[PDB]
Amino acid sequence: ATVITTNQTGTNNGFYYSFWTDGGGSVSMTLNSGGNYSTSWTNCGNFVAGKGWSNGGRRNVQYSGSFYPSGNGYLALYGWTSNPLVEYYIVDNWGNYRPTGTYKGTVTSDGGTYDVYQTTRYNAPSVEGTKTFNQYWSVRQSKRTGGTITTGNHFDAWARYGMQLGSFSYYMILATEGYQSSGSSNLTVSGKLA
Ligand SMILES: O[C@@H]1[C@@H](O)[C@H](O[C@@H]2CO[C@@H](O[C@@H]3CO[C@@H](O)[C@H](O)[C@H]3O)[C@H](O)[C@H]2O)OC[C@H]1O
Ligand SMILES: [Cl-]
Ligand SMILES: [Cl-]
Ligand SMILES: [Cl-]
Ligand SMILES: [Cl-]
Ligand SMILES: [Cl-]
Ligand code: NA
């Protein structure tokens, strides 16, 4: 097992991982065998951590385990595109705060209905440094921890709603995210190209 407490990306037991924190409170990620990781956080500022793939794509993502936010946290298939720069989220679980934005319609996927939203961040941290970019959101209408995410269903719905992804030149991870919160997660990811 390897504990991560400091910003970095890399590979562990055949899986890509990303850890990122603004440095508030206490945040750790433990990288275990195959696709397993755990997180522990107390009074965090903002962090995103998880395992997945060096590049995004159309992938049937299978995951399982636990996700226990006290306050604001997300469980999301998460990644970035280039040209345009986009931060994208397929959110299966959350805490006290449900992600919202400009409502674009729904998509049905993996036993659930997802609300689609677009938001925009100005001069914020990104995989290209301090940048302005849109965020694309699929938010499940009912919370869960575990199952399949057919990323194709989301990407295609986004495209029908005029939300175009760039190139899959950056990571795609099954992410734990917290904001001014405490919690834990213990997750396993796997997947294959549709
Ligand atoms: O060390 C470099 C990092 O600074 C950089 O990491 C990305 C920075 O932005 C992170 O996304 C934020 C997460 O919180 C959301 O609410 C915000 O909208 C985002 O700003 C992302 O997780 C990191 O990968 O990338 C390059 C690194 O070398
Ligand atoms: Cl649902
Ligand atoms: Cl916005
Ligand atoms: Cl500017
Ligand atoms: Cl749960
Ligand atoms: Cl499912
Ligand atoms: Na658009």
Distance 34 CA to ligand 2 centre (A): 29
For residues 80 and 88, the answer to whether their CB atoms sit within 8 Å is yes
Q: Whose structure tokens read 């998509």?
A: 107
What is residue 7's DSSP assignment?
S
Kindly list the distances between the CA atom of residue 160 and the CA atoms of 2, 15, 88, 164, 189, in Å, as whole numbers in the listed order. 41, 31, 16, 9, 28
Kindly provide the b/e burial profile for residues 29-39, where b requires at least 16 CB atoms within 10 angstroms of the residue's own CB: bebbeebbbbb
Q: What angle do CA 162, 117, 115 make, to 5 degrees?
A: 110
Instruction: Answer whether 180's CB lies under 8 Å from 71's CB.
Output: yes
Instruction: Please list the residues that pair with 79 across neighbouring strands.
Output: 88, 172
Exposure string of 134-147, with b = 16+ CB inside 10 Å and e = fewer, is bbbbbbbeeeebee
Q: Strand pairing partners for 115?
A: 106, 139
18 CB under 6 A from ligand 1? Answer: yes
Cβ(75)–Cβ(175) under 8 Å?
yes
Pocket test for ligand 1, best of 8, 48, 173 (most atoms within 8 A of CB): 48
Task: List the catalytic residues.
Answer: 87, 177
CA angle 23, 46, 106 (to 5 degrees): 160
Which experimental method was this entry solved with? X-ray
> Can you read off the two tokens belonging to residue 138?
């699929």
Ligand 1 pocket check for 20: Cβ under 6 Å: yes
Cβ atoms of residues 66 and 183 within 8 Å: no
Find the 13 Cα to ligand 7 centroid distance in Å: 37
Residue 142 DSSP one-character state: S
121 CA: nearest ligand 1 atom: 18
**Biggest CA-to-CA distance, the chain:** 43
Residues with CB under 5 A from ligand 3 (ion): 119-120
Helix, strand or coil for residue 165? coil
For residue 44, with 0-12 CB atoms within 10 Å meaning exposed, 13-18 middle and 19 or more buried, which class applies? buried
Q: How far apart are CA 132 and CA 85, in angstroms?
A: 8
Resolution to 1 decimal place, in Å: 2.0
Q: Among 4, 6, 7, 117, say which to mutate for ligand 1: greatest number of ligand atoms within 8 Å of CB.
A: 7
β-bridge partners, 61:
149, 191
Residue 108 corresponds to which amino acid? T
Q: Map residue 123 onto helix, strand or coil.
A: strand
The three-class DSSP label of residue 193 is: strand
- The Cα 17–Cα 5 span in angstroms is 13
